[PDB]
Write a protein that binds this ligand. Structure first.
Ligand SMILES: [Mg+2]
Length: 811
RNA sequence: GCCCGGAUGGUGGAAUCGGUAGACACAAGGGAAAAUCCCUCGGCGUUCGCGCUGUGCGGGUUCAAGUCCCGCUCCGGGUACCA
């Protein structure tokens, strides 16, 4: 055994070994309990960032630990490889998105190996290859044939009316919302975000006649109980009613054009009068900047007495404000300053007077419904999923338009529709749109023009978790047996910022696949763990020109007070720096830290250990070089204790019967430590305290004598235990130390240590004696003494009723 | 302005159970320039044994609150008129 620990001499040999033995490659083995540990797949930007390192170290810790518990563990890796950055890099360099992307995959793959992540590399996928995207193209054709796909012009952000393909995600909204109650092991924050994003709404559509106007006008309301307080209707700027009025009304015309471009209220009277269906009285119709064209019908019944936006519009333009709901105490409301918003009992409402809110809602709805001018309607904030982009670097959309004018899917025997990778980019137009020949094809015997827009990249990320189960299956999108063996994912790890995009889409996609017969479960992941951001100090100076210039913390020369807080700071050019604290990492604050640099400076194991020790997985992590150094020193001390132990040669069989009292207490701490680290990693997922627990045991182990045969036999049992406990975190050093300790086989398939129950029995326990809360004594008592026995030993104490067994007496 | 989180030593963080506050580590300081190693370290008071105090500020429950409830202050993050 070398005296010095040198990761440059250990890590790449161990990595090569994991590749040569295919250590982390797995199959669908029915004789073992499965565990699917998934980290959000990287985008191949060019190099790993510290967030990848954190995300993927947490997943690797869990994957390795679950393998040591005897489970069959799937930990897959792949590349979300289409998307926008590659077209910008292609143009800037003078290349193409494909070769740039594949070069990045190669470089980042080598980085992930250099971190020692135990992936099943046989299942590696890059989502830009036709072997991947072909199945989403087929799947999109099936969705279309099932009526879940349509095309429409919609406003994207300046503002454009762009045609797009939509998947009807709203067909599944109820279930996406309802099934959140199944998600016990997702965090409350992500669930609430999804609930609010979905925005389920129960209401009524109400249709109005409109004088001297060709069509009726339908509004959506969530408060039909306030119907007799409706003093005007309001319509979105883009509504066809406003469009019409706008032909004779230049005031309106300019308002409608103002709105197309650009929380104040703004509006123009359209001059149209709608007829109130109950009273029969005319009310004015206004165009209003606060009504969304895209939601509901894009028109509202305005009740300024009881909706604050309607109140502020009516106050500004002098429209009638009419009260129809009473205050909590049955008094008429004070509307002199703002709307009365709470649901109450109606007044000023004729036949509907005295009705409470639920009764009012129902009665006014029932009456409009029977009059043929209302109907109950559930709406959603959630929009349908717009899946097309006017971009080149993505999966082609499998639709065609025949010479006819007719629209249909690309035939089965013409899938995949292949994105050509050999292209020159002009910056301006997609190569498959710039070339008129590419879109020309033939379908059902006739000349067609095929779609040139491509899929948004969330299309590929919505199902990759499932394809990892059967990545080389050529017969379909999924081998249902393989997918149902591995799914649902046991734990999915990735940031909270994906909460209402990817983390909603993959739930939807899972359900589509369920309803196609492809999987047999309702949800794709049991547990979601959202790891915190990695932070770093940030500094700037102000130039003579008044501009802020940000300076990397490595270039900061800081000065620290008596208590170590930063009091001044300068750069080597002499600029006075202002310290802004720990801050999210960015190129803008110039405070990013390159994990490659750190891996080369300290070794992967040090970087992994620091990242798991510094803070709980779900909280923010403050990157501190003094902290990383501290981790490196710990591993060096573990290396030292093993070197000195093995230097003494082989070990006698431990004889538990003949152990000394000290020996017995020391062994007790080995086994308690095993029990805690197990519970911390396996159930609590408190990785930082699991490590602290190992460190506290080492501190004792470094003190134990090791001359007598038994002392050494005990250290052997301790160190075999420590090396295994540390292995999910620091597997390179631990792989090597296991061999030095002559552990059996490779550490990766060694059994996780189990605490010996015999080793942990206490002869005695300590009891704190308090008088009136404040501690006045401490006493040792048998782990079997009765109250009165305990309270008697209590009484005997010269300084010395509530009693917790084994813990506390308070008098 | 909304919805959802936070607040413990000089610092990151422990306290899982309402029951010994500060494990573990960093930073300091003392020990045998740099590096390693070993001991001290919440604040104040001290006759060096210890005493009083202490979890942003208030209050409620409790025999007992960092923990559970309710206010106030101050810190972060999402969401842009969804009728
Ligand atoms: Mg603090």
């Amino acid at each position: 055994m070398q005296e010095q620990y040198r990761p440059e001499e250990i890590e790449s040999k161990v990595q090569l070994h994991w590749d040569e033995k295919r250590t982390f490659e797995v199959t669908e083995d029915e004789s073992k309990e499965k565990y699917y540990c998934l980290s959000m797949l990287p985008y191949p930007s060019g190099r790993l960032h510290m967030g990848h390192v954190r995300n993927y170290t947490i997943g690797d810790v869990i994957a390795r630990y679950q393998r040591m518990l005897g489970k069959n563990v799937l930990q897959p890796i792949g590349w979300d490889a289409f998307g926008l950055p590659a077209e910008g890099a292609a143009v800037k360099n003078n290349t193409a998105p494909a070769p740039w992307t594949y070069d990045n995959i190669a470089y980042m793959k080598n980085q992930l190996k250099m971190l020692g992540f135990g992936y099943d590399w046989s299942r590696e996928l890059a989502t830009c290859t036709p072997e991947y995207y072909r199945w989403e193209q087929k799947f999109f054709t099936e969705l279309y044939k099932k009526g879940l796909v349509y095309k429409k012009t919609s406003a994207v952000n300046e503002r454009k009316e762009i045609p797009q393909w939509f998947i009807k995600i709203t067909a599944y909204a109820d279930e996406l919302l309802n099934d959140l109650d199944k998600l016990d092991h997702w965090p409350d924050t992500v669930k609430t975000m999804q609930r609010n994003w979905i925005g389920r709404s129960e209401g009524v559509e109400i249709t109005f006649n409109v004088n001297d106007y060709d069509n009726t006008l339908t509004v959506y309301t969530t408060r039909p109980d306030t119907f007799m307080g409706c003093t005007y209707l309001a319509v979105a700027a883009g509504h066809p009613l406003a469009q019409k009025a706008a032909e004779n009304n230049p005031e309106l015309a300019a308002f409608i054009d103002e709105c197309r471009n650009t929380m104040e209220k703004k509006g123009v009277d359209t001059g149209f009068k709608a007829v109130h269906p109950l009273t029969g009285e005319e009310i004015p119709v206004w165009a209003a900047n606060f009504v969304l064209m895209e939601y509901g019908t894009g028109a509202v019944m305005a009740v300024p007495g009881h909706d604050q936006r309607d109140y502020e519009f009516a106050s500004k333009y002098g429209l009638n404000i009419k009260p129809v709901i009473l205050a909590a105490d049955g008094s008429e409301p004070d509307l002199s300053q703002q709307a009365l918003t709470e649901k109450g009992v109606l007044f000023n409402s004729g036949e509907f007077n005295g009705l409470d809110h639920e009764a009012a809602f129902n009665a006014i709805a029932d009456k409009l419904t029977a009059m043929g001018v209302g109907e109950r309607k559930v709406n959603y904030r959630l929009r349908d999923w717009g899946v097309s982009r006017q971009r080149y670097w993505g999966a082609p959309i499998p639709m065609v338009t025949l010479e006819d004018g007719t629209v249909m899917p690309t035939p089965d025997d013409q899938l995949p529709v292949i994105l050509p990778e050999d292209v020159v980019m002009d910056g301006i137009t997609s190569p498959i749109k710039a070339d008129p020949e590419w879109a020309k094809t033939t379908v059902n015997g006739m000349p067609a023009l095929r779609e040139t827009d491509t899929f948004d990249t969330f299309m590929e990320s919505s199902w990759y978790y499932a394809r990892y189960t059967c990545p080389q299956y050529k017969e379909g999108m999924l081998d249902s047996e393989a997918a149902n063996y591995w799914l649902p994912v046991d734990i999915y790890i990735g940031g909270i910022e994906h909460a209402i995009m990817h983390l909603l889409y993959f739930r939807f996609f899972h359900k589509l696949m369920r309803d196609a017969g492809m999987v047999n479960s309702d949800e794709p992941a049991k547990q979601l763990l959202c790891q915190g951001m990695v932070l770093a100090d940030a500094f700037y100076y102000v130039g003579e020109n008044g501009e802020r210039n940000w300076v990397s913390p490595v270039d900061a020369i800081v000065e620290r007070d008596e208590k170590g807080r930063i009091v001044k700071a300068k750069d080597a050019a002499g600029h006075e720096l202002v310290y802004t604290g720990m801050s999210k990492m960015s190129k803008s604050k110039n405070n990013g830290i390159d994990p490659q640099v750190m891996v080369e400076r300290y070794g992967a194991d040090t970087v992994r250990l620091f990242m798991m020790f510094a803070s709980p997985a779900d909280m923010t992590l403050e990157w501190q070089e003094s902290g990383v150094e501290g981790a490196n020193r710990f591993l060096k001390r573990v290396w030292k204790l093993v070197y000195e132990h093995t230097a003494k040669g082989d070990v006698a069989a431990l004889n538990v019967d003949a152990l000394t009292e000290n020996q017995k207490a020391l062994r007790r701490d080995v086994h308690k430590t095993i029990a805690k680290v197990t519970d911390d990693i396996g159930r609590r997922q408190t990785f930082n305290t699991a490590i602290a627990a190992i460190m506290e045991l080492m501190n004792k182990l470094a003190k134990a004598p090791t001359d007598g045969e038994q002392d050494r036999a005990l250290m052997q049992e301790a160190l075999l235990a420590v090396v295994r406990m540390l292995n999910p975190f620091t597997p390179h050093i631990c792989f090597t130390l296991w061999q030095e300790l002559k552990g059996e086989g490779d550490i990766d398939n060694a059994p996780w240590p189990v605490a010996d129950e015999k080793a942990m029995v206490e002869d005695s326990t300590l009891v704190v004696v308090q008088v009136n809360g404040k501690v006045r004594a401490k006493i040792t008592v048998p782990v079997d003494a009765t109250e009165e026995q305990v309270r008697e030993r209590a009484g005997q104490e010269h300084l010395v009723v509530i009693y917790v067994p084994g813990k506390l007496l308070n008098l």
